Amino acid sequence: LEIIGRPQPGGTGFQPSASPVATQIHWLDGFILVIIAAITIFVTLLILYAVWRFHEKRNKVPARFTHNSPLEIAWTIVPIVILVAIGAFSLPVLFNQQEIPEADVTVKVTGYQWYWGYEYPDEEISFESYMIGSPATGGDNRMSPEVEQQLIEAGYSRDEFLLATDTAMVVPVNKTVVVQVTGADVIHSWTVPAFGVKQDAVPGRLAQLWFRAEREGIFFGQCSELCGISHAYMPITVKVVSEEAYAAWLEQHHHH
Amino acid sequence: FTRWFMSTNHKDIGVLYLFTGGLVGLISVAFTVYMRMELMAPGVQFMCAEHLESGLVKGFFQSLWPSAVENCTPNGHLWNVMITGHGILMMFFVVIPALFGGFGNYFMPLHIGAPAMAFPRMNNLSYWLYVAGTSLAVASLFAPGGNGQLGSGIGWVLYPPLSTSESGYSTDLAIFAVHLSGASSILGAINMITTFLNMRAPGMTMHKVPLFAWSIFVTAWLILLALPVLAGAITMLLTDRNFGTTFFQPSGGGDPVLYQHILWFFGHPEVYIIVLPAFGIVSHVIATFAKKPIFGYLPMVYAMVAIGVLGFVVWAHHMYTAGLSLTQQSYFMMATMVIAVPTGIKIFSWIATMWGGSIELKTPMLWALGFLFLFTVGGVTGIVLSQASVDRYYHDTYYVVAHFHYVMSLGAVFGIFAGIYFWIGKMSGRQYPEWAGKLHFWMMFVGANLTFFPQHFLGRQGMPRRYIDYPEAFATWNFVSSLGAFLSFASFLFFLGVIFYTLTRGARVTANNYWNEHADTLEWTLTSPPPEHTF
Numbered sequence: 001l002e003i004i005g006r007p008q009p010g011g012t013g014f015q016p017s018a019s020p021v022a023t024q025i026h027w028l029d030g031f032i033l034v035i036i037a038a039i040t041i042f043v044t045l046l047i048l049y050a051v052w053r054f055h056e057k058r059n060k061v062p063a064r065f066t067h068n069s070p071l072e073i074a075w076t077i078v079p080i081v082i083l084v085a086i087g088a089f090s091l092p093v094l095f096n097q098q099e100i101p102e103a104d105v106t107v108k109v110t111g112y113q114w115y116w117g118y119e120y121p122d123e124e125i126s127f128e129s130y131m132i133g134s135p136a137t138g139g140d141n142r143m144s145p146e147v148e149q150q151l152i153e154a155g156y157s158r159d160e161f162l163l164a165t166d167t168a169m170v171v172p173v174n175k176t177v178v179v180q181v182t183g184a185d186v187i188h189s190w191t192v193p194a195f196g197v198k199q200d201a202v203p204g205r206l207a208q209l210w211f212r213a214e215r216e217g218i219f220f221g222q223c224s225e226l227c228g229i230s231h232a233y234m235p236i237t238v239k240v241v242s243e244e245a246y247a248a249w250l251e252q253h254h255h256h
Numbered sequence: 257f258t259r260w261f262m263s264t265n266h267k268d269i270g271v272l273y274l275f276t277g278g279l280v281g282l283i284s285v286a287f288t289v290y291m292r293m294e295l296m297a298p299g300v301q302f303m304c305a306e307h308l309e310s311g312l313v314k315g316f317f318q319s320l321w322p323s324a325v326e327n328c329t330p331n332g333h334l335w336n337v338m339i340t341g342h343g344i345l346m347m348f349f350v351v352i353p354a355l356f357g358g359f360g361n362y363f364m365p366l367h368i369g370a371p372a373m374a375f376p377r378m379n380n381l382s383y384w385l386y387v388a389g390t391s392l393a394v395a396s397l398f399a400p401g402g403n404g405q406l407g408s409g410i411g412w413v414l415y416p417p418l419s420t421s422e423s424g425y426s427t428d429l430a431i432f433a434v435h436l437s438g439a440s441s442i443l444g445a446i447n448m449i450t451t452f453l454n455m456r457a458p459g460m461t462m463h464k465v466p467l468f469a470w471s472i473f474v475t476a477w478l479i480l481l482a483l484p485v486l487a488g489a490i491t492m493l494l495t496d497r498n499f500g501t502t503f504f505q506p507s508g509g510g511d512p513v514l515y516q517h518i519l520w521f522f523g524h525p526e527v528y529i530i531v532l533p534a535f536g537i538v539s540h541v542i543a544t545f546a547k548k549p550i551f552g553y554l555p556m557v558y559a560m561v562a563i564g565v566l567g568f569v570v571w572a573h574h575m576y577t578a579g580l581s582l583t584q585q586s587y588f589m590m591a592t593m594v595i596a597v598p599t600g601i602k603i604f605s606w607i608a609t610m611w612g613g614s615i616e617l618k619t620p621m622l623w624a625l626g627f628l629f630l631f632t633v634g635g636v637t638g639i640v641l642s643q644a645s646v647d648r649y650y651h652d653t654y655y656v657v658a659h660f661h662y663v664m665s666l667g668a669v670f671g672i673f674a675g676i677y678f679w680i681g682k683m684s685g686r687q688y689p690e691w692a693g694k695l696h697f698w699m700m701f702v703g704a705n706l707t708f709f710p711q712h713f714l715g716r717q718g719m720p721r722r723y724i725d726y727p728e729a730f731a732t733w734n735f736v737s738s739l740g741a742f743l744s745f746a747s748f749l750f751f752l753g754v755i756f757y758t759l760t761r762g763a764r765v766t767a768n769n770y771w772n773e774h775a776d777t778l779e780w781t782l783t784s785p786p787p788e789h790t791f
């Protein structure tokens with residue numbers, strides 16, 4: 001499988017999109033970025049111009065005005081218009097994100113100190129997912145020859161250290177996945193940048209997110225609410241596969 | 257002598273707060289240097305568990321030199337303790353004491369023509385509560401804490417159940433520190449409000465009060481509502497930890513998310529409390545060095561009032577991924593966007609003030625112009641973050657760290673530096689050397705931008721907050737960010753050299769007003785320094 005949902009050296013953009021929701025985030029952010037880069041350049045060029053034009057050597061006698069009504073009206077309404085425009089594109093995207101559709105696949109995720117537990121209630125599958133290199137796999141949260149070997153064996157490389165887990169959450173491509181997220185002990189947060197999803201895993205609460213992956217591959221997230229000593233060391237691996245490979249993975253877990 | 261610490265005069269108390277805030281600022285900045293040493297490269301090299309086997313002093317020095325990864329067992333607890341220490345010191349024991357406690361106490365009474373403040377004894381007590389709070393915060397770092405080590409690794413906002421399950425009593429000491437800070441702020445706020453209302457000079461009507469005095473007045477009101485709420489939130493943590501309550505524990509029927517609502521109800525106002533006095537200083541400085549009266553005095557006052565008021569109805573934008581309903585998320589997104597209008601606008605008034613003026617690029621003016629640029633860069637990423645759909649991606653990433661170091665951290669810092677250079681002659685009778693002030697500015701300006709701009713990239717690439725270590729792909733921009741931090745630190749040590757020089761052998765100030773006629777408020781009417789008894 002292709003490693004897609006990961007940071008890339010020196011990157012300045014988002015991680016690749018692999019869901020319709022992530023696509024929407026990329027578009028909305030790109031739209032707002034144009035606007036705020038325009039606002040910033042504007043403000044910056046005004047300051048630099050004013051300093052050049054009205055420097056004490058060039059403008060020896062200062063003006064005394066403290067009002068300009070048409071300008072004050074313009075500079076109040078224009079921001080209001082800008083925000084209404086943003087909100088108009090932004091709220092539909094928000095509604096799409098947060099309205100949970102009917103699930104093809106249901107996964108229940110539980111955050112623990114410091115690992116994730118996955119249950120597929122329809123399939124009677126459950127398992128735990130530890131960072132490769134955590135105490136669970138024989139390590140102590142650092143790279144070493146043994147850890148590199150384990151990364152290789154699991155189908156990764158040393159570059160995926162801190163991202164790759166011993167087990168992965170496997171799902172089929174082009175299906176609606178609904179994830180129910182909770183915490184077992186403290187608050188954790190479950191996320192996959194490539195899917196445009198993040199949801200805190202709060203003890204006592206069950207919260208839902210959805211995604212539909214649009215291509216096969218490997219996608220990583222990392223725990224996103226400080227949860228103690230190994231917060232930096234309990235990541236998330238999702239493998240998106242064909243319907244048939246997903247079924248094959250399911251049958252591998254079936255006890256006869 | 258220790259006749260400084262028993263003084264009740266607003267000017268002496270102001271000076272005490274500035275120096276103390278500066279010293280705590282140095283400690284907290286030093287934490288960030290250590291933080292950026294560890295983040296400079298992937299793999300853990302400094303915060304090694306092996307250093308714990310040594311003594312406290314021996315372990316300290318060993319942890320300042322890098323080890324090979326093979327000799328360094330990562331110690332995440334130390335990372336967590338350092339960043340929590342950095343955040344708490346900054347938010348409770350540095351910038352507000354400097355701006356509100358320091359410049360607020362020194363200058364607001366001067367600006368309104370008050371010869372004394374309503375409660376000089378209460379003012380002196382506020383300072384001592386600040387010092388006691390600082391001492392406890394620092395003590396918590398050396399107290400039995402989480403994971404069988406010292407200190408609390410819980411984040412500056414202390415989310416339960418993590419904060420309530422952290423072992424030892426380090427966390428209880430930190431909660432007490434915060435109680436003492438709140439008390440200091442509340443006493444100060446009561447003093448500021450009563451002085452402002454009862455002790456203005458004859459003729460000094462509400463429409464003639466300088467913008468800085470207004471900024472302090474508005475800030476004081478924010479404190480009285482926000483700080484008691486925080487005191488509630490942290491007392492409930494204290495009782496969950498020690499007295500058998502289960503406010504935030506699901507097993508007893510509690511909800512950890514309740515804490516977040518209460519904490520953030522304080523937590524938003526807190527940032528406006530930080531920045532409002534910096535707005536006041538910027539207004540005084542720009543008017544002086546543009547040689548032109550402030551554009552739209554009354555809109556400036558009303559914008560500050562509106563920001564103050566609206567800052568109480570936006571808190572849950574800090575909770576978009578915590579499990580808020582779609583209705584809640586939509587509301588808070590819209591309330592947040594609204595507050596962006598009075599706030600982002602004051603920027604235009606500051607530019608309009610410069611427009612048509614006769615601009616002198618002295619050190620205080622450079623800080624003020626730096627403020628306008630940097631507060632804009634920060635405010636504008638705030639707008640991005642207000643959009644809940646995009647915050648889904650950015651929340652708890654370095655993009656948020658970049659934002660707040662931009663609007664808030666550097667805004668308060670550039671406002672503080674603007675005040676120091678603006679007012680040091682007035683407070684001390686000695687003038688700073690101009691070339692050194694400018695060099696400080698350019699070093700800090702380049703340093704701070706190199707530190708924080710690349711953190712936007714790290715966040716867009718999905719780097720989470722509160723991590724001792726990170727995937728190798730994040731290496732380039734963490735390296736740049738760290739070099740920026742080291743240059744900023746160099747600029748701050750140079751600054752402390754500038755202050756030492758100024759106070760020991762700076763050129764003697766001989767004028768009441770050593771700037772120009774457009775520094776038109778009452779402090780510039782008094783001697784440098786002012787007499788023990790003013791007006």
Ligand code: HEA
Nearest residue numbers: 079527531573596600635636638639641642651660663664
């Ligand atoms: C100085 C204090 C300060 C200020 C003024 C702001 C300003 C703003 N903040 Fe920021 N914020 C913080 C301090 C501050 N912030 C802190 C400390 C945190 C995180 C704390 C933590 O988690 O540890 C945070 C986090 C934070 C979040 C949560 C992020 C997350 O956790 O995922 C959000 C979400 O909406 C947000 C939004 C905004 C917005 C919309 C503005 C707006 O008010 C900005 C207004 C815009 C400008 C100033 C730009 C200039 C504008 C113009 C020149 C023209 C005006 C035109 C338009 C507005 C269209 N902020």
Ligand code: HEA
Nearest residue numbers: 277278281288343346354411412665721722723741744748
């Ligand atoms: C005013 C608030 C403030 C200020 C000034 C700073 C200053 C700095 N911060 Fe801070 N930061 C916070 C508030 C602030 N911070 C908070 C609340 C957090 C969250 C903690 C948490 O996660 O719980 C945080 C977290 C935080 C992180 C993320 C930690 C993590 O998630 O793991 C990082 C990473 O580099 C960082 C770095 C720095 C650096 C390099 C500086 C500085 O070195 C930048 C250079 C600036 C200077 C050199 C000048 C400083 C001047 C003063 C402080 C004024 C002193 C007073 C007088 C002179 C009178 N900080």
Ligand SMILES: CCCCCCCCCCO[C@@H]1O[C@H](CO)[C@@H](O[C@H]2O[C@H](CO)[C@@H](O)[C@H](O)[C@H]2O)[C@H](O)[C@H]1O
Nearest residue numbers: 046065066067068069071074075604605607608611612
């Ligand atoms: C949104 C971004 C905007 C950033 C702000 C920077 C732009 C500021 C432009 C100021 O415009 C000036 O306003 C003055 C006052 O309104 C006008 O003076 C006019 O009115 C004065 C007031 O009576 C008279 O003294 C003058 O002679 C007369 O020219 C002047 O023509 C006009 O150029």
Ligand SMILES: CCCCCCCCCCO[C@@H]1O[C@H](CO)[C@@H](O[C@H]2O[C@H](CO)[C@@H](O)[C@H](O)[C@H]2O)[C@H](O)[C@H]1O
Nearest residue numbers: 112113114115130134135136137140141229230233234
């Ligand atoms: C009749 C039946 C009676 C019940 C008997 C059960 C006895 C076995 C319980 C084992 O307990 C586990 O011990 C681990 C090792 O100490 C813990 O790992 C914890 O500590 C590790 C080492 O610090 C971390 O890496 C892990 O993430 C963290 O979960 C783990 O949580 C805990 O559940």
Ligand SMILES: CCCCCCCCCCO[C@@H]1O[C@H](CO)[C@@H](O[C@H]2O[C@H](CO)[C@@H](O)[C@H](O)[C@H]2O)[C@H](O)[C@H]1O
Nearest residue numbers: 112113114135136185228229230402403404405421423
């Ligand atoms: C019919 C049979 C009767 C059974 C009765 C036995 C009762 C068992 C008590 C369970 O409490 C455990 O205490 C451990 C020790 O305090 C904890 O380990 C924690 O603390 C250890 C260090 O003390 C670490 O090594 C672990 O990583 C960390 O999980 C562990 O989580 C917790 O569940």
Ligand SMILES: CCCCCCCCCCCCC
Nearest residue numbers: 012013036037040633636712
């Ligand atoms: C595909 C590369 C996109 C790079 C965008 C840079 C983002 C910087 C965000 C900060 C903007 C503040 C004005």
Ligand SMILES: CCCCCCCCCCCCC
Nearest residue numbers: 289290293319320321322323
């Ligand atoms: C062989 C290791 C490279 C040496 C670099 C160590 C520099 C450490 C600087 C510590 C100074 C404290 C701020």
Ligand SMILES: CCCC[C@@H](O)[C@@H](O)CO
Nearest residue numbers: 123124247248250251254
């Ligand atoms: C693809 C194989 C399906 C096996 C199915 O019966 C199990 O997932 C149920 O436990």
Ligand SMILES: [Ca+2]
Nearest residue numbers: 294297299300
């Ligand atoms: Ca490192």
Ligand SMILES: [Cl-]
Nearest residue numbers: 265266372373
């Ligand atoms: Cl007084």
Ligand SMILES: [Cu+]
Nearest residue numbers: 188223227231
């Ligand atoms: Cu976690």
Ligand SMILES: [Cu+]
Nearest residue numbers: 223225227231
């Ligand atoms: Cu975590």
Ligand SMILES: [Cu+]
Nearest residue numbers: 523524571574
């Ligand atoms: Cu806020």
Ligand SMILES: [Mg+2]
Nearest residue numbers: 224225651652
């Ligand atoms: Mg969070």
Ligand SMILES: [O-]
Nearest residue numbers: 523524525527
């Ligand atoms: O905030």
